[PDB]
């Protein structure tokens, strides 16, 4: 039954199983095909690949915005469609390369999707992890300032830093980062991934790091190289450099 599941215990074991996909406005153009992998909790899994390989598409399918045209997208061995949409939203947090923040305050941006009301100490905490706290404080009303009443247009890094704070404060089981730290400062890029890798609270949570930046991908527990809508190969940084294929060619080229 659709939208019937909302378990007390959520592990966060994501699996794509022989997943194929095409957008419904272009069904005769294959984007994904034979896509199979498992994202384990307690691991930061990197998803790297060239332009048009279908990384953002995989992120869209994992958020349950689209159904796969073939195969299955499983969460704890159960199709995403069977999970309640709000429950899924409370357990899974997704952050894009260009996050939409307009129409609310910075507080409301960070406290987005939460049932409970977080304290300032909670809000500042997650904002300082993403490097959002200092420039937000620079605005007239701080976190209470509306997006658009800041004085000037926010940079892509600044929007990402806020959208990352939203993801962190929710305490999700599945964290999806679709180039979510691309415009961020080089230090803040690694500070965020250090938290996700080293901290004990994320040691029981699943993290999907989609990125084309090699310095980010090499620090993941596990790397998935996407090519032609499917996984070319996978393993650790040093494992892929051992034999030589899709990943090694990219490292040597760049
Ligand atoms: N809404 C859409 N409608 C139709 N086609 C789309 C849509 N979104 C993406 N595509 C197409 O699907 C393919 C995969 O797109 P996707 O953005 O997932 O690749 P990507 O690896 O994320 O690329 P990049 O890393 O450059 O963003 C592309 O060829 C793109 O043109």
UniProtKB/Swiss-Prot annotation:
Domain notes: The peptide-binding site is shared between the cytoplasmic loops of TAP1 and TAP2. The nucleotide-binding domain (NBD) mediates ATP hydrolysis coupled to peptide translocation. Two ATP molecules are accommodated at distinct nucleotide binding sites (NBS) at TAP1-TAP2 dimer interface. Each NBS is formed by Walker A (GxxGxGKST) and Q-loop motifs from NBD of one subunit, while the NBD from the second subunit completes the active site by contributing the C loop motif (LSGGQ). Each ATP molecule is coordinated via the beta- and gamma-phosphates to a Mg2+ ion, which is necessary for ATP hydrolysis.
Lineage: Eukaryota, Metazoa, Chordata, Craniata, Vertebrata
Full protein: residues contained: 467 to 720 of 725
Quaternary assembly: Heterodimer of TAP1 and TAP2 (TAP1-TAP2). A component of the peptide loading complex (PLC), interacts via TAPBP with MHCI heterodimer; this interaction mediates peptide-MHCI assembly. Interacts with PSMB5 and PSMB8.
Subcellular location: Endoplasmic reticulum membrane
GO molecular function, a single term: TAP2 binding
Keyword annotations from UniProtKB, A to Z: Adaptive immunity, ATP-binding, Endoplasmic reticulum, Immunity, Magnesium, Membrane, Metal-binding, Nucleotide-binding, Peptide transport, Protein transport, Translocase, Transmembrane, Transmembrane helix, Transport
Binding residue positions for Mg(2+): 56
Record function comment: ABC transporter associated with antigen processing. In complex with TAP2 mediates unidirectional translocation of peptide antigens from cytosol to endoplasmic reticulum (ER) for loading onto MHC class I (MHCI) molecules. Uses the chemical energy of ATP to export peptides against the concentration gradient. During the transport cycle alternates between 'inward-facing' state with peptide binding site facing the cytosol to 'outward-facing' state with peptide binding site facing the ER lumen.
Binding locations of ATP: 49-57, 152-158, 212
Protein's UniProt keywords contain Endoplasmic reticulum: yes
Protein name in UniProt: Antigen peptide transporter 1
Topological region Cytoplasmic: 1-254
GO biological process, one term: transmembrane transport
Annotated family: Belongs to the ABC transporter superfamily. ABCB family. MHC peptide exporter (TC 3.A.1.209) subfamily.
Effect seen on changing residue 185 to A/N: Decreases ATP-driven nucleotide binding domain (NBD) dimerization
Domain (ABC transporter) ranges: 14-253
Any GO CC annotation of this UniProt entry: membrane
Coiled-coil positions: none
Superkingdom of the organism of origin: Eukaryota
């Amino acid at each position: 039954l659709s939208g019937s599941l909302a378990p007390l215990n959520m592990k966060g074991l994501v699996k794509f199983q022989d997943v194929s996909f095409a957008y419904p406005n272009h069904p005769n153009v294959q984007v994904l095909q034979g896509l199979t992998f498992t994202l384990y909790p307690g691991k930061v899994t990197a998803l790297v690949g060239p332009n048009g390989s279908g990384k953002s598409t995989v992120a869209a399918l994992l958020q349950n915005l689209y159904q796969p045209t073939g195969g299955k997208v499983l969460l704890d061995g159960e199709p995403l469609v069977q999970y309640d949409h709000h429950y899924l939203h409370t357990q899974v947090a997704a952050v894009g390369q260009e996050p939409l923040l307009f129409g609310r305050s910075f507080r409301e941006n960070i406290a987005y999707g939460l049932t409970r009301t977080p304290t300032m100490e909670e809000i500042t905490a997650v904002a300082m992890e993403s490097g959002a706290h200092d420039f937000i404080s620079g605005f007239p009303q701080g976190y209470d300032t509306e997006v658009g009443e800041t004085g000037n247009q926010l940079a892509v890094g600044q929007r990402q830093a806020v959208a990352l704070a939203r993801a962190l404060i929710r305490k999700p089981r599945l964290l999806i980062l679709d180039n979510a730290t691309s415009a961020l400062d080089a230090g803040n890029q690694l500070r965020v991934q250090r938290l996700l890798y080293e901290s004990p609270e994320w040691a029981s949570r699943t993290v999907l790091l989609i990125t084309q930046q090699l310095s980010l991908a090499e620090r993941a527990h596990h790397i998935l190289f996407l090519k032609e809508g499917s996984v070319c190969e996978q393993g650790t940084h040093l494992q892929l450099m051992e034999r030589g294929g899709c990943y090694r060619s990219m490292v040597e080229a760049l």
